[PDB]
Amino acid sequence: LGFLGAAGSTMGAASMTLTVQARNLLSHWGIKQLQARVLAVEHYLRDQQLLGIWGCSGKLICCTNVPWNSSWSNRNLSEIWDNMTWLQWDKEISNYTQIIYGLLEESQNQQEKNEQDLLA
Amino acid sequence: LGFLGAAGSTMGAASMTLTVQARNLLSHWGIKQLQARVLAVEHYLRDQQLLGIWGCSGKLICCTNVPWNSSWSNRNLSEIWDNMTWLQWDKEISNYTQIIYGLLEESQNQQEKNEQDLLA
Amino acid sequence: LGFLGAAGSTMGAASMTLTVQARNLLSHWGIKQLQARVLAVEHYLRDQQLLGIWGCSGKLICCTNVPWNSSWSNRNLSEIWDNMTWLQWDKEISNYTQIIYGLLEESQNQQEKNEQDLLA
Amino acid sequence: NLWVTVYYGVPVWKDAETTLFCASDNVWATHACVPTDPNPQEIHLENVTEEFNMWKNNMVEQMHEDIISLWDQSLKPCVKLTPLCVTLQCTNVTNNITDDMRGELKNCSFNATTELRNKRQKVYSLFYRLDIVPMGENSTNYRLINCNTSAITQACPKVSFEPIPIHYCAPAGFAILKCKDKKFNGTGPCPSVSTVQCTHGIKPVVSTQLLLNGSLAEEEVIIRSENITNNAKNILVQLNTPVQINCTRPNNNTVKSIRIGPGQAFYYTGDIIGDIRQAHCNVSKATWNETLGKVVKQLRKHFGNNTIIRFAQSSGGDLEVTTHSFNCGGEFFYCNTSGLFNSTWISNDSITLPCRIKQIINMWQRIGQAMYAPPIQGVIRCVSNITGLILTRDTTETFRPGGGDMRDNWRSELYKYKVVKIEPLGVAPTRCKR
Amino acid sequence: NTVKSIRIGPGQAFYYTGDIIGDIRQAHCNVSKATWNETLGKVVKQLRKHFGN
Amino acid sequence: NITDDMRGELKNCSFNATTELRNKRQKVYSLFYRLDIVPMGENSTNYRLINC
Ligand SMILES: *[C@@H]1O[C@H](CO)[C@@H](O[C@@H]2O[C@H](CO)[C@@H](O[C@@H]3O[C@H](CO)[C@@H](O)[C@H](O[C@H]4O[C@H](CO)[C@@H](O)[C@H](O)[C@@H]4O)[C@@H]3O)[C@H](O)[C@H]2NC(C)=O)[C@H](O)[C@H]1NC(C)=O
Ligand SMILES: *[C@@H]1O[C@H](CO)[C@@H](O[C@@H]2O[C@H](CO)[C@@H](O)[C@H](O)[C@H]2NC(C)=O)[C@H](O)[C@H]1NC(C)=O
Ligand SMILES: *[C@@H]1O[C@H](CO)[C@@H](O[C@@H]2O[C@H](CO)[C@@H](O)[C@H](O)[C@H]2NC(C)=O)[C@H](O)[C@H]1NC(C)=O
Ligand SMILES: *[C@@H]1O[C@H](CO)[C@@H](O[C@@H]2O[C@H](CO)[C@@H](O)[C@H](O)[C@H]2NC(C)=O)[C@H](O)[C@H]1NC(C)=O
Ligand SMILES: *[C@@H]1O[C@H](CO)[C@@H](O[C@@H]2O[C@H](CO)[C@@H](O)[C@H](O)[C@H]2NC(C)=O)[C@H](O)[C@H]1NC(C)=O
Ligand SMILES: *[C@@H]1O[C@H](CO[C@@H]2O[C@@H](C)[C@@H](O)[C@@H](O)[C@@H]2O)[C@@H](O)[C@H](O)[C@H]1NC(C)=O
Ligand SMILES: *[C@@H]1O[C@H](CO[C@@H]2O[C@@H](C)[C@@H](O)[C@@H](O)[C@@H]2O)[C@@H](O)[C@H](O)[C@H]1NC(C)=O
Ligand SMILES: *[C@@H]1O[C@H](CO[C@@H]2O[C@@H](C)[C@@H](O)[C@@H](O)[C@@H]2O)[C@@H](O)[C@H](O)[C@H]1NC(C)=O
Ligand SMILES: *[C@@H]1O[C@H](CO[C@@H]2O[C@@H](C)[C@@H](O)[C@@H](O)[C@@H]2O)[C@@H](O)[C@H](O)[C@H]1NC(C)=O
Ligand SMILES: *[C@@H]1O[C@H](CO[C@@H]2O[C@@H](C)[C@@H](O)[C@@H](O)[C@@H]2O)[C@@H](O)[C@H](O)[C@H]1NC(C)=O
Ligand SMILES: *[C@@H]1O[C@H](CO[C@@H]2O[C@@H](C)[C@@H](O)[C@@H](O)[C@@H]2O)[C@@H](O)[C@H](O)[C@H]1NC(C)=O
Ligand SMILES: *[C@@H]1O[C@H](CO)[C@@H](O)[C@H](O)[C@H]1NC(C)=O
Ligand SMILES: *[C@@H]1O[C@H](CO)[C@@H](O)[C@H](O)[C@H]1NC(C)=O
Ligand SMILES: *[C@@H]1O[C@H](CO)[C@@H](O)[C@H](O)[C@H]1NC(C)=O
Ligand SMILES: *[C@@H]1O[C@H](CO)[C@@H](O)[C@H](O)[C@H]1NC(C)=O
Ligand SMILES: *[C@@H]1O[C@H](CO)[C@@H](O)[C@H](O)[C@H]1NC(C)=O
Ligand SMILES: *[C@@H]1O[C@H](CO)[C@@H](O)[C@H](O)[C@H]1NC(C)=O
Ligand SMILES: *[C@@H]1O[C@H](CO)[C@@H](O)[C@H](O)[C@H]1NC(C)=O
Ligand SMILES: *[C@@H]1O[C@H](CO)[C@@H](O)[C@H](O)[C@H]1NC(C)=O
Ligand SMILES: *[C@@H]1O[C@H](CO)[C@@H](O)[C@H](O)[C@H]1NC(C)=O
Ligand SMILES: *[C@@H]1O[C@H](CO)[C@@H](O)[C@H](O)[C@H]1NC(C)=O
Ligand SMILES: *[C@@H]1O[C@H](CO)[C@@H](O)[C@H](O)[C@H]1NC(C)=O
Ligand SMILES: *[C@@H]1O[C@H](CO)[C@@H](O)[C@H](O)[C@H]1NC(C)=O
Ligand SMILES: *[C@@H]1O[C@H](CO)[C@@H](O)[C@H](O)[C@H]1NC(C)=O
Ligand SMILES: *[C@@H]1O[C@H](CO)[C@@H](O)[C@H](O)[C@H]1NC(C)=O
Ligand SMILES: *[C@@H]1O[C@H](CO)[C@@H](O)[C@H](O)[C@H]1NC(C)=O
Ligand SMILES: *[C@@H]1O[C@H](CO)[C@@H](O)[C@H](O)[C@H]1NC(C)=O
Ligand SMILES: *[C@@H]1O[C@H](CO)[C@@H](O)[C@H](O)[C@H]1NC(C)=O
Ligand SMILES: *[C@@H]1O[C@H](CO)[C@@H](O)[C@H](O)[C@H]1NC(C)=O
Ligand SMILES: *[C@@H]1O[C@H](CO)[C@@H](O)[C@H](O)[C@H]1NC(C)=O
Ligand SMILES: *[C@@H]1O[C@H](CO)[C@@H](O)[C@H](O)[C@H]1NC(C)=O
Ligand SMILES: *[C@@H]1O[C@H](CO)[C@@H](O)[C@H](O)[C@H]1NC(C)=O
Ligand SMILES: *[C@@H]1O[C@H](CO)[C@@H](O)[C@H](O)[C@H]1NC(C)=O
Ligand SMILES: *[C@@H]1O[C@H](CO)[C@@H](O)[C@H](O)[C@H]1NC(C)=O
């Protein structure tokens, strides 16, 4: 029930503890510790900015409009959400990550301009 | 009308100055000042993270789906929102705050999963 | 197409590179560099706080309910979006800015109270 | 059919190198330590298998820097013994000296500075021979060993060198993973890993070839080396039982002091009460023989089984690496372990180790610093646990004591910990779409 | 120059010129004459655009 | 053998330097540029380093 307790569990189980980990991201001698705190803050903010760019601000689970190319991972749902741990999944889409992030950004920009053109 | 000007007023009045206080939360000799700034930032981010977790991100007034068990405070809307100041209210539901925060977190997690299983 | 690449283009074109600039806002000897990092973070957070206050949290383009008093700039749309560059626009309406920001804040406060009084 | 869904707060991590913050309860546990050790929570990760590695763990390096730095800071307010770098005329000690003490001590007189610039005083003191160097070959004229190189700083007598445990805690965004496999040899997959908030307290004990007061193996002697077939690597042997060692400096010293300047006091041994005897340490003989037998049985699992394992004394180098160095009650001992490693193993007695004492030491493997340890009044006795050995390797294999590098002592405690960064953001396909 | 050194303190070495081997000559720098004369002519040509022609 | 242009530019100076031992001094002979020393008294070879 604690931090990373679900790390060895399947993705479909681990997705239920997202708030457990999210809350553990925030909190001359002493300079290097101060630098570490500042950098931890910058890291945190970059992840939040990125969720904002993709239109996922404010939520732990964000559905998008980008489809999954089978060439990234051709596994089915009962082989990704029942037979794999997030650690093993991360080391399978690791070299298709930037592709996905780029697509998510493009999808959100198209959605924002289209919504504005609909509010007229 | 300025920062904390409404502190001595009733909750039903003070609730209209939320932006006044929100805008005053941000901004070896000299090291202690950097340490203070970093900690002020971490504090700020933790408040924002909770609003994120509870689904209140981006707003100063947020309604929820958690009910008010009368065992926390059995006062009626009149007494709370037209007599008590926020300082007095906070000192009443001080013991029963962690409970409320835990309930808000659980409610949002239930809401996120249901919503996903409806856009499927 | 890089950072500030669109600075010399017209507003109607430059608006398509908002993510290019957003992603470049984040990332005794060494103290001055820590001060710079901390201040860059505080600057970033103040802008994000302000978007939150106005009800524009999480998005790069936000439409509001505040109308354009023509006294600020009586130029038409074909003169603002087809010819002027964001740098020239900023110079033109720079001293009527802190009026616009005040109006945006007031509009959102009214918007929040009306939605709570409706969710009743 | 499937769409990308973004998840945040995902229990995933990657190896990372960051700065850890110390938490404790006089050089160690300085004011620079978040006063906690609360209840460092341990959250067994169950079905996780993580590629642990010592001999890469950067925590070793951070601790090394920290300790060296804390040590140097403790000397910043202390007296510099530079007015004392003068010709010291020396003779033999007028006492009852045993054979093992010949000559070991010298009675040295010199002209010292004092509080007023136009005043001077004659001072004499007792020095160990290892702290002074003859000037002009065979002559009564001698100089302190470190006056041709760096200036010596007197340690402040109010500050105790006794090791104080320091816990190392992760900064937010990071976690420390602990390997609980009782048979873990320092590398490779660890089938039982838990997440901890902060490490246990580690005592920064400074010793060479015999590791003192460390952690014991849970079940069996564990032999850990970066590459067992590489003679350039050291072997750390963790014992599953302690061996008790009893050390003494059996001479009742009288400590005197002088002012060498305005608020600057120098401490020295004035005289010795009673006979002059050699410092020494006792190790139970049977216990030690059983301990080596266990080590041999485990070495034979890496080396041939029908083999011969021989132990021998360190072959060479300076006193810092040929002996067992340690701090006993504030004095610095250099004990001869040839009595412990003198046997061949083929397919209520005790061992006494002679010990030398020095007052002028360098501590870390550095050239530009030197420290004077004030002598301590009275008679010193300390008891400690041998918890591991540092060995090097030459049919028949021969092993000798090593331990010149301090990083290895710290590796014997930090080998079970790894630092990772949490990477909470990621994606996966689902049947859901906006 | 032959450089010699002494200790003046506890690990503190001082360096100095011990002796000079051979004759003593003045230090100096060479600038090509034609190159330098052309260089100033260009500078003058440009100065005349700010000053009288 | 000094070129005319260098006459008076260098001086050969003998001094008492400190040593490793606080109570001892050593005689040192070194070559200084005239620009780094100043005279002290006139009609005398007593010179001192410029910035003391
Ligand atoms: C391995 O662990 C053992 C067990 O902890 C350790 O032995 C301990 O050593 C310390 C330091 O020598 C002993 O502490 C002293 O105890 C006496 C007895 O009353 C006190 O009088 C001493 O106080 C004087 O000295 C202090 C400075 O050190 C001053 O601050 C004080 O004012 C006094 O002048 C001091 O407290 C301790 O008793 C032993 N423990 C046992 C069980 O013998 C051993 O040293 C460790 N091994 C290594 C290599 O570190
Ligand atoms: C070290 O030498 C000093 C003399 O330089 C010895 O001190 C003298 O001892 C005699 C005999 O007890 C006394 O009468 C003198 O008054 C002492 N002189 C001083 C200055 O104290 C000292 O005993 C010698 N110590 C050792 C260990 O040999
Ligand atoms: C300390 O200084 C004293 C003088 O105050 C030295 O005493 C000299 O000793 C030598 C050796 O016999 C004599 O020849 C001198 O005549 C003594 N000086 C005087 C004026 O009495 C003493 O040796 C010095 N000690 C050291 C080695 O530092
Ligand atoms: C270490 O071992 C030695 C023996 O080698 C012990 O020395 C004896 O100590 C008693 C007093 O307790 C004396 O009466 C004996 O005469 C000593 N023996 C010899 C041969 O001299 C010593 O006490 C032991 N303890 C330690 C180091 O703590
Ligand atoms: C520890 O003590 C032993 C004696 O037991 C010393 O060993 C002797 O060293 C010399 C010089 O190399 C050899 O010629 C002798 O043959 C050795 N004796 C034995 C019995 O082997 C050893 O050097 C001492 N070590 C230290 C660090 O002091
Ligand atoms: C999917 O993507 C293909 C292009 O991607 C190629 O393969 C991936 C794994 C990466 O290595 C990438 O660099 C390569 O360029 C396209 O052929 C294909 O049409 C795409 N399919 C869909 C459904 O769009
Ligand atoms: C998902 O796929 C499962 C296993 O199928 C086999 O192994 C994988 C790794 C591929 O090599 C695939 O071509 C093989 O056929 C099935 O057992 C499982 O039933 C499938 N699940 C669903 C619901 O499609
Ligand atoms: C309401 O509270 C009832 C009493 O239980 C507890 O004590 C009070 C003072 C609060 O601290 C509360 O949070 C504790 O649970 C419960 O028996 C009852 O089930 C609660 N009802 C609801 C709506 O949860
Ligand atoms: C609200 O209640 C007032 C009396 O308050 C009583 O005591 C407090 C502490 C609470 O326990 C409250 O529930 C009790 O009723 C009335 O005087 C007042 O008229 C009521 N106002 C209404 C009807 O909203
Ligand atoms: C539009 O603006 C008119 C003039 O505004 C005045 O001058 C500007 C620069 C500001 O200083 C503003 O505060 C001044 O009032 C107003 O008279 C008129 O009411 C405004 N109309 C609207 C739509 O509010
Ligand atoms: C837009 O305006 C162009 C000329 O602008 C004139 O001056 C500016 C400052 C404004 O006052 C504007 O309203 C004036 O008309 C015209 O050439 C152009 O035709 C106009 N286009 C449209 C769409 O009205
Ligand atoms: C580990 O796997 C077992 C099944 O072998 C399962 O019962 C247990 O819940 C799993 N633990 C975690 C943390 O997922
Ligand atoms: C993965 O899960 C599917 C559905 O439960 C199952 O049919 C398949 O055999 C599993 N494969 C394994 C055991 O990795
Ligand atoms: C990309 O990642 C996949 C899964 O980890 C791996 O099989 C493949 O070899 C990787 N390719 C490269 C270029 O490393
Ligand atoms: C303070 O109390 C008086 C009544 O005594 C009330 O009229 C006034 O509005 C209150 N002040 C504030 C800031 O609410
Ligand atoms: C203030 O308290 C009194 C007594 O409980 C109550 O009658 C009144 O309704 C409360 N607030 C107002 C002014 O509505
Ligand atoms: C809250 O807890 C404190 C300490 O137990 C107690 O004194 C106080 O009365 C409690 N207040 C409420 C509202 O229950
Ligand atoms: C610069 O101006 C020219 C017209 O003179 C236009 O064609 C070009 O697209 C403009 N450059 C950018 C970056 O907009
Ligand atoms: C202004 O906009 C018009 C219409 O797009 C265009 O034809 C003209 O070239 C633009 N002029 C400038 C200065 O960009
Ligand atoms: C304010 O801006 C307008 C338009 O740019 C300009 O005409 C006016 O002079 C400015 N006033 C000030 C305060 O400079
Ligand atoms: C002083 O001690 C040394 C070393 O033990 C010895 O060689 C020398 O003969 C002794 N001198 C006197 C005078 O006792
Ligand atoms: C000091 O003297 C010793 C004599 O054994 C010599 O080995 C060492 O190098 C000398 N140190 C310096 C800095 O000259
Ligand atoms: C430690 O154990 C691992 C088990 O995978 C083995 O590969 C490695 O060679 C062993 N190392 C030593 C020094 O025994
Ligand atoms: C150990 O050293 C030998 C030297 O011959 C080398 O061949 C071997 O690869 C090394 N082992 C490892 C794990 O690097
Ligand atoms: C160490 O001292 C204890 C008493 O404190 C004694 O029982 C033990 O036998 C001694 N051990 C050795 C090796 O001398
Ligand atoms: C040490 O072990 C060997 C081999 O078992 C044995 O022959 C010898 O007698 C033992 N010595 C002691 C003191 O126990
Ligand atoms: C090595 O000897 C042990 C007994 O000490 C035995 O159990 C093991 O099987 C032997 N291994 C080989 C390869 O002979
Ligand atoms: C090793 O033991 C033998 C007796 O078996 C003894 O003669 C020899 O001196 C000892 N060597 C050392 C260094 O103690
Ligand atoms: C040392 O001798 C003095 C004087 O007789 C005595 O008071 C003191 O207790 C002795 N100390 C020890 C450790 O024997
Ligand atoms: C040696 O280990 C035993 C068993 O853990 C412990 O009780 C004892 O205190 C330890 N000795 C020292 C000096 O720490
Ligand atoms: C500098 O030296 C080079 C030879 O290295 C020579 O060719 C060049 O002409 C010299 N320049 C001057 C200004 O003397
Ligand atoms: C420099 O230029 C001037 C003007 O052209 C000319 O009279 C003079 O002779 C030149 N000098 C040299 C060295 O070329
Ligand atoms: C200055 O002289 C140049 C020729 O060297 C000529 O081209 C230029 O026009 C003149 N300018 C004026 C202002 O006379
Ligand atoms: C020494 O040099 C000076 C110039 O600095 C000169 O005037 C003087 O005559 C020279 N004396 C001798 C003896 O060479």
**What is d(CA A101, CA E24) in angstroms, rounded to the nearest whole number?**
72
Alpha-carbon torsion, ordered D405, D408, D413, D418, to 10 deg: 120
Considering only the beta carbons, identify the residue of A31, A57, A63 that sits closest to B119: A63
Which residues have a Cβ under 8 Å from the Cβ of D302 and sit 6 or more positions away?
Answer: D223, D228
Among protein residues, the one with the nearest Cα to ligand 19's atom 14 is C83
State the Cα angle at A83 between A78 and A89, rounded to 5°. Answer: 100
- Ligand 16 pocket test: which of B73, B82, B89 has the largest number of ligand atoms within 8 Å of its C-beta? B82
Ligand 12 centroid from CA D177, angstroms: 19
Give exposure, D241-251, as e/b (b: 16+ Cβ within 10 Å): ebbebebbbeb
In this complex, the residue of B22, B38, B58 whose CB is nearest that of residue C58 is: B58
| Whole-number Å distance between alpha carbons of D431 and D433 | 7
Nearest CA to B60 among C112, C32, D19, A9?
C112
Contact D252, D378 (CB under 8 A): yes
Radius of gyration, alpha carbons of chain E: 24
Q: Contact at 8 Å (CB) between D341 and D349? A: no
The answer for residues whose C-beta is within 8 angstroms of residue B97's C-beta and 6 or more apart is none
Is A59 within 8 Å of A101 (Cβ atoms)?
A: no
Hey, what long-range contacts does D89-98 have (CB within 8 A, 24 or more apart)? D89/D140, D89/D141, D89/D142, D90/D127, D90/D132, D90/D140, D90/D142, D91/D140, D93/D126, D93/D272, D93/D276, D95/D272, D95/D275, D95/D276, D96/D275, D96/D276, D97/D275, D97/D276, D98/D275, D98/D276, D98/D277, D98/D278
* Overall residue count recorded for chain E in this entry: 53
Q: Is the Cα torsion angle C49, C51, C54, C58 positive or negative in sign?
A: negative
> What is the number of residues in chain B?
120
* B–C CB contacts, 8 A cutoff, strictly below: 50
The owner of tokens 């790390």 is A7
Q: B35 — contact with chain A (CB < 8 Å)? A: yes
Token pair listed for D24: 């404790």
The strand pairing partners of D266, in sequence order, are D258
DSSP string of A37-85?
Answer: HHHHHHHHHHHHHHHHHTT-TT-SEEEEEEE--TTT----HHHHSSS--
Residue D238 backbone zone (phi > 0: left; psi -120 to 50: alpha; other: beta): beta
Count other Cβ atoms within 10 Å, centred on residue D280. Answer: 18
Could you tell me if D376 and D269 are in contact, meaning their C-beta atoms sit under 8 angstroms apart?
no
Q: Which ligand 9 atom is the nearest neighbour of the CA of B75?
A: 10
Strands D152-154 and D370-372: parallel
Q: How far is CA D222 from CA B14, B107, D232, D235, D386, in A?
A: 67, 51, 19, 10, 14
Taking CA atoms, D270 is separated from C82, D108, D146, D266, F2, in Å, by: 95, 11, 21, 12, 62
- The residue of chain C nearest to residue A106, with distances taken between CA atoms, is C19
Identify the helix (H) or strand (E) that includes residue D127: strand D120-128
The C-alpha angle D255, D258, D263, rounded to 5 degrees, equals 125
What does the alpha-carbon distance between residue D420 and residue D431 come to, in Å, rounded to a whole number? 32
Distance CA D282, CA D167 (A): 32
Q: What angle do CA A93, A95, A98 make, to 5 degrees?
A: 95
Say how far apart CA D413 and CA D54 lie, in whole Å.
10
Helices C31-53 and A31-53: crossing angle, nearest 10°? 30
Q: In what order do the strands lie in the sheet with D42-44?
A: D13-15, D417-422, D174-179, D193-196, D42-44
- Contacts F9 to E, Cβ<8 Å: 26
Q: Considering only alpha carbons, which residue of chain A is nearest residue D195?
A: A4
* DSSP letter assigned to residue E24: B
Distance CA D29, CA D6 (A): 44
- Determine the residue type at D209: Q
| CA–CA gap between residue D283 and residue D292 (Å, rounded) | 13
How many Cβ atoms are within 10 Å of B115's Cβ, its own excluded? 13
Residue with tokens 């045993």: D98
- If one counts every other C-beta atom within 10 angstroms of the C-beta of residue E19, the result is 12
Q: What is the DSSP letter of D151?
A: P
Nearest chain B residue to D6 by CA distance is B116
Q: Is D271 helix (H, G, I), strand (E, B) or coil?
A: strand
Instruction: Say how far apart CA C60 and CA A112 lie, in whole Å.
Output: 8
| Number of other CB atoms surrounding residue F4 within 10 Å | 6
D359: left (phi over 0), alpha (psi -120 to 50) or beta: alpha
* Coil, helix or strand at residue E8: strand
Are the CB atoms for D123 and D257 separated by under 8 Å?
no
* C118, D47, E50 from E42: Cα distances, Å: 81, 79, 14
Cβ of D433 within 8 Å of Cβ of B116? The answer is: no
F19-51 in b/e form (b: 16+ CB < 10 A) is ebbbeeeeebebbbeeeeeeeeeeeeeebeeee
- Distance in angstroms (rounded) separating the CA atoms of residues D106 and D122: 16
What is the structure's resolution, reported in angstroms to one decimal? 3.5
**Chain B nearest-CA residue for D431:** B120
Distance from the Cα of C99 to chain A's closest Cα (Å) equals: 24
Could you tell me how many CB contacts below 8 A there are between chain D and chain F?
Answer: 18
**The residue type at D373:** A
Instruction: Give the Å distances, CA to CA, from D214 to D39, D218, D225, D263, D362.
Output: 21, 13, 18, 40, 23
- Out of B49, B55, B109, closest to residue A26 by CB: B49
Q: Are D83 and E8 in contact (CB under 8 A)?
A: no
Strands D152-154 and D222-225, sheet pairing: unpaired
Query: Which residues from chain E sit within 8 angstroms of residue D150, using beta carbons?
Result: 10-11
- Identify whether the C-beta of residue D256 lies closer than 8 Å to the C-beta of residue D385: no
Q: Does residue D363 contact residue D406 with C-beta atoms inside 8 Å?
A: no
| Residue among B25, B26, B63 whose CB faces C119 most closely | B63
B9 lines ligand 15 (CB under 6 A): yes
From the number of C-beta atoms within 10 Å of its C-beta (0-12, 13-18, 19+), residue D143 rates as middle
Residue with tokens 């002592």: D409
Beta-carbon count within 10 A of D95 CB: 16
Token pair of A119, please? 């509010």
Q: What is the DSSP string of C7-75?
A: GGS-HHHHGGGHHHHHTTS---TTHHHHHHHHHHHHHHHHHHHHHHHTT-TT-SS---S----TTT---
- Between CA B13 and CA B45 the distance in angstroms is 27
Burial (Cβ within 10 Å: 0-12, 13-18, ≥19) of residue D230: exposed
Here the tokens at position A53 are: 């760019």
Q: For residue D427, how far is its CA from the centre of ligand 12 (angstroms)?
A: 23
Give strand pairing partners of D52.
D188
Determine contact: B34 vs chain C, CB below 8 A: yes
Tell me the HSE value of C31 on the side-chain side, using a 13 A CA sphere.
13
- Contact present, D380 and D248 (Cβ < 8 Å): yes
Distance B68 CA to ligand 17 centre (A): 19
From chain D residues 151-180, the ones with a CB under 8 A of any chain A CB are 171-173, 175
* CB of D147 less than 8 A from some CB of F: yes
C-alpha gyration radius of chain A: 18
E11 reaches D (C-beta below 8 A):
yes
Q: How far apart are CA B23 and CA B4, in angstroms?
A: 11
Sign of dihedral through CA atoms B99, B104, B109, B114?
positive
3-state secondary structure D326-380: EEECCEEEEECCCCCCCEEEECCCEEEEEEEEECEECCCCCCCCEEECCCCCEEE
Distance CA E38, CA C80 (A): 54
How far apart CA D190 and CA D187 sit, in angstroms, is: 8
Return the H-helix or E-strand segment holding A108: helix A97-119
Among D185, D181, D180, D217, CA closest to D196: D180
CB within 8 Å: E6 and F20: no
| Contact check, Cβ <8 Å, D147/F23 | no
Q: Which atom of ligand 12 is nearest to the CA of A9?
A: 14
How far is D149 from chain F, CA to nearest CA, in Å? Answer: 8
Beta-ladder partners of D125: D108
Determine whether the interchain pair B53/A19 forms a contact, defined as Cβ–Cβ distance below 8 Å: yes
Is residue D257 a contact partner of residue D267, using CB atoms and an 8 Å limit? yes
Query: Which stretches of D155-300 are assigned E, i.e. beta strand?
Result: 167-169, 174-179, 187-190, 193-196, 210-212, 222-225, 235-261, 264-273, 279-284
For the Cβ of A95 lying below 6 angstroms from any atom of ligand 14, the answer is yes
Beta strands D21-24 and D34-35 are parallel
The percent of chain E in helix, strand and coil, each rounded to the nearest 5, is: 30, 30, 40
Phi-psi region of D55 (alpha: psi -120 to 50; beta: other; left: phi over 0): left
- Cα separation, B34 vs D369, whole angstroms: 34
Helix (H/G/I), strand (E/B), else coil: A16:
helix
* D196: nearest Cα among D217, D172, D166, D169: D169
Residue A46: CB atoms within 10 Å: 15
Mapped to the 3 state alphabet, what secondary structure does chain B carry? CCCCHHHHCCHHHHHHHHHHHHCCCCCCCCHHHHHHHHHHHHHHHHHHHHHHHHCCCCCCCCCCCCCCCCCCCCCCHHHHHHCCCHHHHHHHCCCCCHHHHHHHHHHHHHHHHHHHHHHC
